[PDB]
Amino acid sequence: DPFYYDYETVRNGGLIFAALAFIVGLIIILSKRLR
Amino acid sequence: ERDMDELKKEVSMDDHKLSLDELHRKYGTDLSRGLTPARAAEILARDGPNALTPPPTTPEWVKFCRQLFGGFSMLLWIGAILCFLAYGIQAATEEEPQNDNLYLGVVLSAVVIITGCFSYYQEAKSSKIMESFKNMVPQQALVIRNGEKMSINAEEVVVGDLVEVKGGDRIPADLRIISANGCKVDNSSLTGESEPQTRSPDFTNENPLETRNIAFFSTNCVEGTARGIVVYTGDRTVMGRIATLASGLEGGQTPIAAEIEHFIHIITGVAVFLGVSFFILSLILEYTWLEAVIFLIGIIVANVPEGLLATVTVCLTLTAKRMARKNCLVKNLEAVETLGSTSTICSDKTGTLTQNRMTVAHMWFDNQIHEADTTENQSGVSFDKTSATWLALSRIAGLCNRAVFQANQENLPILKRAVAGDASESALLKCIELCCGSVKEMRERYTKIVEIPFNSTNKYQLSIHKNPNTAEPRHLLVMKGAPERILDRCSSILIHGKEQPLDEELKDAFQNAYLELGGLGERVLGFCHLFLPDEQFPEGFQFDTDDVNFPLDNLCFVGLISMIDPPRAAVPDAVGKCRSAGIKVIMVTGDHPITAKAIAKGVGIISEGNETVEDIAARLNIPVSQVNPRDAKACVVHGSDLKDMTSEQLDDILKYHTEIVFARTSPQQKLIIVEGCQRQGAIVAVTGDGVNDSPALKKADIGVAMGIAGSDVSKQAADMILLDDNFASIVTGVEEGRLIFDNLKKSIAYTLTSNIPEITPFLIFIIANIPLPLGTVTILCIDLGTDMVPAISLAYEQAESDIMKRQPRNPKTDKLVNERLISMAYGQIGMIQALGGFFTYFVILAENGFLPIHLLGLRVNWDDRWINDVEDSYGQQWTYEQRKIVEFTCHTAFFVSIVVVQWADLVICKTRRNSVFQQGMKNKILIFGLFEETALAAFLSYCPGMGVALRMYPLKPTWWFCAFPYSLLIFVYDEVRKLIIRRRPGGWVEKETYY
Amino acid sequence: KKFIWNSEKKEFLGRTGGSWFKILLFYVIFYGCLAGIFIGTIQVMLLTISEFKPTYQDRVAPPGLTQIPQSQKTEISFRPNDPQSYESYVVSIVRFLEKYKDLAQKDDMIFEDCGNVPSELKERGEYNNERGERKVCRFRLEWLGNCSGLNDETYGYKDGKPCVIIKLNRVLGFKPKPPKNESLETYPVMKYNPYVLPVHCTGKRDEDKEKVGTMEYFGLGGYPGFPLQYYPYYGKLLQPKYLQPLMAVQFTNLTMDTEIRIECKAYGENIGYSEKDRFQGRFDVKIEVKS
Ligand SMILES: *[C@@H]1O[C@H](CO)[C@@H](O[C@@H]2O[C@H](CO)[C@@H](O[C@@H]3O[C@H](CO[C@H]4O[C@H](CO[C@H]5O[C@H](CO)[C@@H](O)[C@H](O)[C@@H]5O)[C@@H](O)[C@H](O)[C@@H]4O)[C@@H](O)[C@H](O[C@H]4O[C@H](CO)[C@@H](O)[C@H](O)[C@@H]4O)[C@@H]3O)[C@H](O)[C@H]2NC(C)=O)[C@H](O)[C@H]1NC(C)=O
Ligand SMILES: *[C@@H]1O[C@H](CO)[C@@H](O[C@@H]2O[C@H](CO)[C@@H](O[C@@H]3O[C@H](CO[C@H]4O[C@H](CO)[C@@H](O)[C@H](O)[C@@H]4O)[C@@H](O)[C@H](O[C@H]4O[C@H](CO)[C@@H](O)[C@H](O)[C@@H]4O)[C@@H]3O)[C@H](O)[C@H]2NC(C)=O)[C@H](O)[C@H]1NC(C)=O
Ligand SMILES: CCCCCCCC/C=C\CCCCCCCC(=O)OC[C@H](COP(=O)(O)OCC[N+](C)(C)C)OC(=O)CCCCCCC/C=C\CCCCCCCC
Ligand SMILES: CCCCCCCCCCCCCCCCCC(=O)OC[C@H](COP(=O)([O-])OCC[N+](C)(C)C)OC(=O)CCCCCCCCCCCCCCCCC
Ligand SMILES: CCCCCCCCCCCCCCCCCC(=O)OC[C@H](COP(=O)([O-])OCC[N+](C)(C)C)OC(=O)CCCCCCCCCCCCCCCCC
Ligand SMILES: CCCCCCCCCCCCCCCCCC(=O)OC[C@H](COP(=O)([O-])OCC[N+](C)(C)C)OC(=O)CCCCCCCCCCCCCCCCC
Ligand SMILES: CC(C)CCC[C@@H](C)[C@H]1CC[C@H]2[C@@H]3CC=C4C[C@@H](O)CC[C@]4(C)[C@H]3CC[C@]12C
Ligand SMILES: CC(C)CCC[C@@H](C)[C@H]1CC[C@H]2[C@@H]3CC=C4C[C@@H](O)CC[C@]4(C)[C@H]3CC[C@]12C
Ligand SMILES: CC(C)CCC[C@@H](C)[C@H]1CC[C@H]2[C@@H]3CC=C4C[C@@H](O)CC[C@]4(C)[C@H]3CC[C@]12C
Ligand SMILES: [Mg+2]
Ligand SMILES: [Mg+2]
Ligand SMILES: [Mg+2]
């Protein structure tokens, strides 16, 4: 079906990136040794 | 405000009539030892803290709700109300309607909730930090409890407590004078007259105000020292009843907030004007009645930087905390911005520039200079302790002294113990105790009959002692003071025991020795004595103190004594930074011109090459009056000369001189010097520690009060408090003051940059008639949800290396929001951001089937909900919702491109003068925001259901990288621009883009 | 007026003349380079897409069923007795039907006569320019029974028998596939031809389904639908004058002066629907013959 683009793959990739970036930002703001 | 002489002369009932016994049995207090700490705690817990009742504080659900329904928030609340009303209308119409308007209204509600909570959190943090300052260094009170005198918190003082105050002390509560020794209080805040009235235990008047045995709250003792008993505490105090309801502060305006308010009103007006214009245009373009308000709200939000006030509050509070952590306690929030504009610093030599830890180092007697103060190895001195003249020198150095050693000090050396008295007196005591013997016994044999403390009128000390010897005429007058003045008060000098008349040869040698010791950075003091004739003054003669009867002249000079007072460690570097930052520093001290000149030259006030008129004359062996006055860039002005000077001469000296040092200048004359500096158009910061400095501290733009040795009068009469009395702290404070301006301008530039790329799509959609590239939901999402943290992150940026390498800023010409700032944010950066957004939008539409050229004019049928056969560039037919999905996808792509360009803009906004490679990304909050905004955007674009809730659909990967060239372009452009400004200062780029 | 203009240094509105010329020149070169960079990136992006196929087509899938004449709110209400209340519908129908007359389909190189009965799809091969343009499956107006613009120009609107011609969304590279007879158990009874994508008009509610009347279907060979021999579409660059399959429906014996909402739904394998987009695969039309 050359009319169906897998949107779930991109959705999962973006959600994975969002979660990773949020965790990184959380670690940066709540850093224990990042002085 | 008729609260003076009318609301005071009526509420009056005291117990000044009570005698010592009646007072003791009434309050139940040990008149000689004070109440016990246990009893003090009991009275404290019974009556309450010694403080005034504070005003009511609004609860937590008051500020939160006021922010929720704030001014700007009202627009979104009304938008949600209109959306819910439209959904209600749509529910009554045609069956099976859609939830588009319902979801839009709920989205607006969520936006308002998030904005309100974030603003409430920021305001709460600012309020908490601001309140933390009132308890930084609270005012202390010296009370007497269980026999010992201790300094406790002012709020811990209760009625009946035995309190002791001195010159420069602030009265903690209404008191009854029990014992006093020449005490004079100032009732300017009580009766109106600034003239000081004496306070004495003797009952002289039945009226509470007129009596001499009652100390009132809020007033301060100008001269003397006394002990009293608290008669009323808290709100019951005399001045307390008046200061609680009639001394409230008025509406103090902060210029940093005023300039922002002005720009805020301008931007609000232009934004609302464009909003209503687009509103009427949208209605004319056959659009929904609700879509018009949607576009209006979006335009207003994207063009109004409604977070400017919050950013300003964050910058002010953060830098205020920075100053507090660097020994700069800002009494008021306005001074926080005046520090960066500082241009002249009138500091003192003893106390602030130096550590005031004097040490007797050199002496001069028997026409010779002698070193002393052995390194406590019991070596004594470098000369003989049996010198005849040295005996008279030690005698007058210890007998005329006024300082005494405290208890529990006979177990540690003399060069490391504490004293009670003048700093110079402390050095003299530690000297005689190290190389002569016991001062306690020396001061006992020569019993002191009468003593005259150091007075500005006499300019010398004085003391009469009875000698228990047999070869003396029972009288020994001893006095010290200014070497030049002490020398004019003598007729003879003691040389190895023999007294010989003071001829001109001896005076020449004394002058040479004076200049020699003065050039070394030591304060010299002259000492002399006299053995009055016995036939004229018998053993039992009564020397009157008030009525001088004994001879004051024709005495006998013994010798000179000089002490070492090293400057602070950071002082040379501080003055170096001051000169490197175009800040004129003036030293105001009361020492001799030679000593002050040497100290100023050593600390860096007077750099090499700069010579005064006297130095030039000495080098060319010509009279000083003949030398050219303009050839001297630096000078040392004498106090006596300053007294006979006019405003014109003052302006001439302060105008054509770059390094001025006013020596022998009394502290009261400081006000005139500050006035002269201000008259030259300069923002001055003046240091004060005594009570007479009050007029000068109040007149100066920034009064810096000494926090350690400074009295309460100076602290309450100043604008800033130096936590360590270190001069370098003032320079660090000025640096932080400039940093506030730098960060405020950077944040302003970053918040306004996003306005252009957010409003350009509406303008192009109306001019080019292309499908909407950026929607209202997207603009609201960006401004209130993603760039809310980065805009605040700029307040935490540190200072560049050129912060103290530029001229100071003048409030009359250098303002925050200038034309160049708009030209840079709206004309250069905003244009690149908008171009990147349009590029990504064109990429999406071109990839889905509509060529960029074909999109012109299609908005007419694109927005049509019934023409569901729009032919694309390839000839395909799209429906209404199908094409709208692509339009919303383009909106999300524009949102992503916006965040991408915001990354580069935020990075380049970290610095406006240096390169991003020099400052570095040491800003943790900034990087946190970079990560948070990207994460939030990704989540909003990929979270399931956003396509129908936020109308945001998943964004394909090959689109996320469409705006990267624009971000890198902004990065390289700003870097080369800053490189040009650095390599060519004052150039066209600097004079045109340096905001 | 001081800010407006000062003759001292020739400052106009705040800035001097030399400064005005300098900023004008700098802004011109800067904006020129910026717009040129934008155009360059535009062209570089365009060099990635093809001239005969879009890089993404999942957004147009499945195709949507549309009706002619295009009507506001999909409402086709008119007065048969009034000679002008249906002029808009007739004119909009003719505007689209004029492209299917015998005069336009004259040239034999551009127009080719395809099967008169539903046959297999006319696949031309690949989407390239090796063969230049391609023929167009001719579609005579006569395939529409009573609403063809050949005998009755009112299309039934004059006699209270409206004819709403149905149309399928033109999609490049789409191969419609009707549902197999094996699963023919949900959609209503209709003539089954494995080479025709079916379309059936029905009411919407128990009242609409009752007041509709008699449905009359007109299509190629009389089959209620679109012949498979008219697909796939090759775009405007390969088939500039391509003519898509059509089908009309006549609403006879409909209650006068009553609003009836009808829904024509197309069936097939690659034919889907949507709850929010009422035009993806089907369409609803409100008609009222108020005479
Ligand atoms: C939509 O298209 C359809 C085509 O499928 C059209 O259908 C026609 O409908 C009319 C009206 O209902 C029918 O007329 C009936 O004719 C019966 C007898 O006709 C016989 O002769 C016909 C041949 O001759 C006629 O046709 C040609 C055109 O083809 C004319 O040029 C010619 O001059 C003649 O007019 C045969 O084709 C037919 O099969 C018969 O053998 C009548 O008995 C009948 O009358 C009854 O119905 C009346 C109304 O209900 C009623 O009042 C009477 O009392 C009586 O009960 C009726 O008149 C056609 O048969 C039919 N087909 C054709 C081919 O014409 C339809 O008209 C069209 N819609 C519109 C709006 O035009
Ligand atoms: C398809 O469309 C046709 C016509 O459009 C419908 O048939 C009927 O057609 C007539 C016109 O000839 C319509 O008009 C008139 O309605 C009057 C209202 O009375 C109604 O109710 C009474 C109840 O007492 C019924 O008995 C009566 O039949 C009506 O339904 C009548 O008074 C008129 O009477 C004439 O017709 C009847 C029936 O042929 C004769 O017996 C009389 O002598 C007289 O000539 C006339 O009927 C009528 O409204 C139409 N009926 C409808 C719309 O229901 C078809 O019904 C319609 N098809 C379907 C399936 O509904
Ligand atoms: C101080 C606090 C700060 C907070 C700020 C951050 C705010 C974060 C916002 C939301 C957090 C997570 C919300 C949970 C969402 C997932 C819920 C879920 O499990 O959803 C399941 C289904 C989706 O299923 P599907 O994909 O198959 O459907 C597709 C439909 N088709 C096929 C027709 C297109 O959804 C459904 O049923 C119904 C749809 C539900 C979608 C909800 C999404 C949010 C909606 C309103 C919230 C508005 C918040 C705005 C915040 C912006 C800040 C800038
Ligand atoms: C119908 C088309 C309508 C197009 C409208 C386009 C509008 C573009 C601007 C949008 C938002 C602008 C917000 C400005 C906010 C300014 C706030 C402020 O205080 O600024 C002070 C600043 C000044 O700062 P200042 O006041 O602090 O400092 C002044 C310093 N001295 C005194 C030395 C000068 O304002 C300016 O510098 C002037 C800005 C002028 C901007 C002019 C934009 C013109 C737009 C033309 C578009 C034409 C389109 C034609 C299309 C044709 C199609 C066929
Ligand atoms: C799915 C993955 C998602 C990853 C998301 C990552 C988000 C990261 C946060 C922000 C990114 C966007 C802004 C980056 C800003 C970098 C600024 C900078 O110059 O820092 C210099 C600074 C310089 O400071 P310094 O401290 O190193 O140097 C000091 C030097 N003295 C002492 C002499 C003063 O260093 C850094 O910030 C360290 C990190 C640099 C990270 C650079 C990343 C980009 C690298 C090249 C550009 C892209 C090239 C792509 C090539 C592609 C080829 C096919
Ligand atoms: C064929 C080459 C291909 C190259 C591909 C890209 C490779 C990566 C390119 C840049 C990343 C590394 C940058 C290092 C910059 C200098 C860092 C530094 O610390 O020097 C200290 C010096 C500063 O030294 P300083 O002396 O001021 O600081 C130290 C002070 N003491 C000693 C007291 C501690 O840096 C600068 O002065 C920076 C000047 C930058 C001018 C830039 C002009 C052009 C604008 C952007 C340039 C390109 C940016 C990257 C673009 C990437 C695009 C993909
Ligand atoms: C050093 C700096 C400039 C790099 C900036 C990081 C960029 C490259 C990051 C930020 C967000 C990221 C995207 C986040 C989500 C997705 C969806 C996924 O299904 C494909 C990858 C894709 C599209 C990521 C590609 C990489 C990306 C665009
Ligand atoms: C995309 C096109 C159509 C918009 C054209 C707008 C141009 C003519 C406008 C947009 C913003 C404007 C600038 C905005 C601010 C300033 C600062 C002021 O002190 C001098 C003029 C100057 C430098 C303006 C010059 C004219 C300008 C560049
Ligand atoms: C040395 C510098 C100037 C090189 C600049 C390269 C430019 C021309 C390149 C860098 C990144 C590129 C973009 C990267 C990703 C996409 C998405 C794709 O679906 C269409 C092309 C598009 C939009 C590209 C267009 C060309 C582009 C902007
Ligand atoms: Mg002083
Ligand atoms: Mg002041
Ligand atoms: Mg913004």
mmCIF file of N, CA and C and ligand atoms in Angstrom, chain B residues 839 843 847 958 961-962 965, chain C residues 41 44-45 48, ligand 9:
data_model
loop_
_atom_site.group_PDB
_atom_site.id
_atom_site.type_symbol
_atom_site.label_atom_id
_atom_site.label_comp_id
_atom_site.label_asym_id
_atom_site.label_seq_id
_atom_site.Cartn_x
_atom_site.Cartn_y
_atom_site.Cartn_z
ATOM 1 N N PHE B 839 10.362 28.520 5.436
ATOM 2 C CA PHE B 839 11.050 27.496 4.664
ATOM 3 C C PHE B 839 10.535 26.113 5.028
ATOM 4 N N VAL B 843 8.465 23.499 2.740
ATOM 5 C CA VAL B 843 8.976 22.144 2.556
ATOM 6 C C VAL B 843 7.865 21.128 2.779
ATOM 7 N N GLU B 847 6.288 18.883 -0.175
ATOM 8 C CA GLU B 847 6.447 17.437 -0.094
ATOM 9 C C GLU B 847 5.106 16.720 -0.109
ATOM 10 N N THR B 958 12.492 14.156 8.528
ATOM 11 C CA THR B 958 13.182 14.982 7.540
ATOM 12 C C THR B 958 12.753 16.443 7.587
ATOM 13 N N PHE B 961 14.914 18.871 10.603
ATOM 14 C CA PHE B 961 16.198 19.429 10.206
ATOM 15 C C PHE B 961 16.077 20.489 9.121
ATOM 16 N N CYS B 962 14.873 20.994 8.855
ATOM 17 C CA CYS B 962 14.745 22.008 7.815
ATOM 18 C C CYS B 962 15.199 23.387 8.278
ATOM 19 N N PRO B 965 19.768 25.177 9.097
ATOM 20 C CA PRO B 965 20.620 26.192 8.461
ATOM 21 C C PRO B 965 20.338 27.591 8.967
ATOM 22 N N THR C 41 17.736 27.967 -0.822
ATOM 23 C CA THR C 41 17.291 26.806 -0.065
ATOM 24 C C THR C 41 15.988 26.270 -0.641
ATOM 25 N N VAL C 44 16.966 24.277 -3.671
ATOM 26 C CA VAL C 44 17.648 23.050 -3.277
ATOM 27 C C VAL C 44 16.638 22.043 -2.749
ATOM 28 N N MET C 45 15.613 22.520 -2.036
ATOM 29 C CA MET C 45 14.579 21.611 -1.552
ATOM 30 C C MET C 45 13.767 21.067 -2.720
ATOM 31 N N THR C 48 14.622 17.930 -4.785
ATOM 32 C CA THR C 48 14.442 16.631 -4.148
ATOM 33 C C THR C 48 13.129 15.970 -4.534
HETATM 34 C C1 LIG D 9 27.751 25.546 3.788
HETATM 35 C C2 LIG D 9 26.223 25.704 4.003
HETATM 36 C C3 LIG D 9 25.631 27.036 3.472
HETATM 37 C C4 LIG D 9 25.377 24.559 3.402
HETATM 38 C C5 LIG D 9 23.854 24.952 3.464
HETATM 39 C C6 LIG D 9 23.142 23.728 2.883
HETATM 40 C C7 LIG D 9 21.609 23.965 2.644
HETATM 41 C C8 LIG D 9 21.421 24.428 1.183
HETATM 42 C C9 LIG D 9 20.976 22.622 3.018
HETATM 43 C C10 LIG D 9 21.395 22.260 4.521
HETATM 44 C C11 LIG D 9 20.172 21.470 5.148
HETATM 45 C C12 LIG D 9 19.242 21.275 3.916
HETATM 46 C C13 LIG D 9 17.815 20.878 4.204
HETATM 47 C C14 LIG D 9 17.855 19.581 5.068
HETATM 48 C C15 LIG D 9 16.499 18.851 5.071
HETATM 49 C C16 LIG D 9 15.543 19.114 4.178
HETATM 50 C C17 LIG D 9 14.248 18.304 4.214
HETATM 51 C C18 LIG D 9 13.801 17.695 2.866
HETATM 52 O O1 LIG D 9 12.582 16.985 2.963
HETATM 53 C C19 LIG D 9 13.789 18.831 1.820
HETATM 54 C C20 LIG D 9 15.128 19.555 1.724
HETATM 55 C C21 LIG D 9 15.613 20.171 3.055
HETATM 56 C C22 LIG D 9 14.741 21.409 3.413
HETATM 57 C C23 LIG D 9 17.077 20.605 2.864
HETATM 58 C C24 LIG D 9 17.275 21.755 1.860
HETATM 59 C C25 LIG D 9 18.747 22.163 1.649
HETATM 60 C C26 LIG D 9 19.402 22.547 3.023
HETATM 61 C C27 LIG D 9 18.790 23.790 3.683
#
